[PDB]
Amino acid sequence: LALSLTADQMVSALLDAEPPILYSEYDPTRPFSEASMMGLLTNLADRELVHMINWAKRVPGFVDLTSHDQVHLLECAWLEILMIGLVWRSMEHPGKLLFAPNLLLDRNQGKCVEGMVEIFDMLLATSSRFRMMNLQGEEFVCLKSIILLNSGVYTFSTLKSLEEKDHIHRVLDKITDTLIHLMAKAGLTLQQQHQRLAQLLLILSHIRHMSNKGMEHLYSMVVPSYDLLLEMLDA
Amino acid sequence: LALSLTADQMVSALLDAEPPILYSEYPFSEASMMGLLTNLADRELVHMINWAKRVPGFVDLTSHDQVHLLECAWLEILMIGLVWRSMEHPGKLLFAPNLLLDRNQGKCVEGMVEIFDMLLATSSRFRMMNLQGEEFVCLKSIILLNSGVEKDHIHRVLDKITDTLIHLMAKAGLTLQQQHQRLAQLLLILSHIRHMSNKGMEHLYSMKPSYDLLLEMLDA
Numbered sequence: 001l002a003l004s005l006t007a008d009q010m011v012s013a014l015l016d017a018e019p020p021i022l023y024s025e026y027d028p029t030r031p032f033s034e035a036s037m038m039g040l041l042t043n044l045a046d047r048e049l050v051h052m053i054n055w056a057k058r059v060p061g062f063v064d065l066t067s068h069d070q071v072h073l074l075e076c077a078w079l080e081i082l083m084i085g086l087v088w089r090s091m092e093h094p095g096k097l098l099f100a101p102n103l104l105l106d107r108n109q110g111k112c113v114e115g116m117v118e119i120f121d122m123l124l125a126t127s128s129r130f131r132m133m134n135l136q137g138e139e140f141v142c143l144k145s146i147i148l149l150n151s152g153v154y155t156f157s158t159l160k161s162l163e164e165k166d167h168i169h170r171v172l173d174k175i176t177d178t179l180i181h182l183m184a185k186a187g188l189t190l191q192q193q194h195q196r197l198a199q200l201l202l203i204l205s206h207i208r209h210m211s212n213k214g215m216e217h218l219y220s221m222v223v224p225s226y227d228l229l230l231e232m233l234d235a
Numbered sequence: 236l237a238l239s240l241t242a243d244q245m246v247s248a249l250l251d252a253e254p255p256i257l258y259s260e261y262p263f264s265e266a267s268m269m270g271l272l273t274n275l276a277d278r279e280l281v282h283m284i285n286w287a288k289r290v291p292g293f294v295d296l297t298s299h300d301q302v303h304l305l306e307c308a309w310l311e312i313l314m315i316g317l318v319w320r321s322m323e324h325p326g327k328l329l330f331a332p333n334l335l336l337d338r339n340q341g342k343c344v345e346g347m348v349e350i351f352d353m354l355l356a357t358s359s360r361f362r363m364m365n366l367q368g369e370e371f372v373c374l375k376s377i378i379l380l381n382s383g384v385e386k387d388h389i390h391r392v393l394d395k396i397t398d399t400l401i402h403l404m405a406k407a408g409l410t411l412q413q414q415h416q417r418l419a420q421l422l423l424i425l426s427h428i429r430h431m432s433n434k435g436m437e438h439l440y441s442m443k444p445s446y447d448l449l450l451e452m453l454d455a
């Protein structure tokens with residue numbers, strides 16, 4: 001039962017599910033070329049993908065879905081989930097993106113790739129906004145799980161798929177309750193609780209925009225197949 | 236003035252700024268569907284600039300900031316308006332009252348059948364939620380101010396529209412649990428709306444607004 005958990009239990013599951021922080025390929029030729037930077041970043045994302053699937057299976061409600069729909073959700077969300085992880089890692093490094101512990105890149109180093117400096121500016125801006133809002137890890141892991149579930153749910157049809165959508169909205173309602181509980185426990189007024197909830201959820205639309213602009217720039221210079229995701233889930 | 240508004244003043248202001256539903260101009264099946272939709276889009280744009288000026292707090296921003304917000308939000312604003320008025324026509328998109336299209340007519344343009352399916356799903360989602368017209372106008376204003384984001388003024392105004400949405404839900408008679416849940420349900424659709432807008436721009440660069448263009452329109 002996924003919809004049985006209390007708000008306090010839900011936070012433990014999400015924090016226990018959290019994937020590890022990984023390193024980039026140790027000691028590349030620095031400084032980077034456009035080819036070598038895209039090599040290291042690609043190397044990192046593909047290794048992070050494996051821990052995202054293991055994370056995804058531990059997110060309450062996800063394993064209850066069919067395998068086909070689990071792939072669909074991850075196929076829509078995987079870049080947004082990498083991006084918010086980056087933005088979260090970066091928080092306490094103003095003007096810098098912490099891709100890995102050994103790969104802290106400032107704004108000016110995005111220039112190497114060309115077109116990329118646009119994407120860096122957007123990722124940095126999101127991290128500034130999180131620093132402005134004083135985003136907490138309990139709130140952060142809740143927003144990641146909302147991205148995983150929400151960002152592919154609209155494209156689903158029979159009585160099976162109707163229940164599958166309804167189930168997802170029920171878990172999304174559960175994660176909303178869990179976000180508000182944390183804000184109430186922290187001692188914000190109801191007016192502030194609602195105001196903060198809205199501000200957090202409106203940042204997910206900017207993350208989607210960053211994801212799309214990111215996908216376009218990646219095709220400008222591969223993207224994860226249905227078979228790779230299914231293989232990683234069952235095995 | 237904008238920061239001092241009550242929920243009813245905000246809603247009534249947004250309902251009275253609401254632009255009109257226009258028509259496509261075409262008469263046999265001579266058609267050319269893309270130019271027909273572009274003719275519509277361009278005429279709708281002109282009403283959007285005047286709708287934007289009547290949104291509380293927007294006029295208090297510098298005309299540099301007003302152009303940046305509309306440059307980012309124009310296509311989402313057209314889409315939510317299309318999706319809102321398609322609500323009572325499952326399977327069809329009501330571009331104009333004389334231009335109601337089904338998903339087979341979406342295949343008339345190469346690539347757009349993908350975009351059609353997302354727009355019908357958004358409409359399908361609005362129907363399943365019983366999205367109300369007071370909530371609809373609030374969400375358009377949110378899209379205008381959010382997609383681009385002096386900066387703290389914008390966030391102060393967005394906090395008022397959150398207060399407004401919650402007031403309408405409480406007025407409607409929702410429990411506190413249902414209020415904050417329904418708020419989240421509406422604001423998470425904006426993420427899907429943004430995604431559709433990004434897909435639409437890419438699709439339009441296969442077929443077919445500048446910084447100058449929007450600034451020129453805003454002054455008059």
Ligand SMILES: Oc1ccc2c(c1)O[C@H](c1ccc(OCCN3CC(CF)C3)cc1)C1=C2CCOc2cc(O)ccc21
Pocket residue numbers: 041042043044045046048049082083085086099116119123214215217218222223224225228
């Ligand atoms: O031009 C770029 C635009 C955006 C990015 C970027 C480059 O660098 C990486 C990247 C991402 C995906 C990718 O995927 C390539 C396709 N792989 C192959 C398939 C698995 F086999 C998925 C290759 C490289 C990257 C971003 C966005 C910022 O957020 C990140 C956060 C992370 O934690 C890790 C990486 C990124």
Ligand SMILES: Oc1ccc2c(c1)O[C@H](c1ccc(OCCN3CC(CF)C3)cc1)C1=C2CCOc2cc(O)ccc21
Pocket residue numbers: 272273275276277279280313314316317330347350435436438439442443444445
């Ligand atoms: O491939 C397409 C992808 C998306 C659309 C579409 C075609 O049809 C029109 C469209 C939009 C803009 C455009 O452009 C207007 C002109 N350009 C030049 C610049 C100055 F105005 C903008 C030309 C055509 C359209 C959509 C999205 C669905 O929502 C709509 C709602 C409306 O109320 C009106 C139009 C649309």
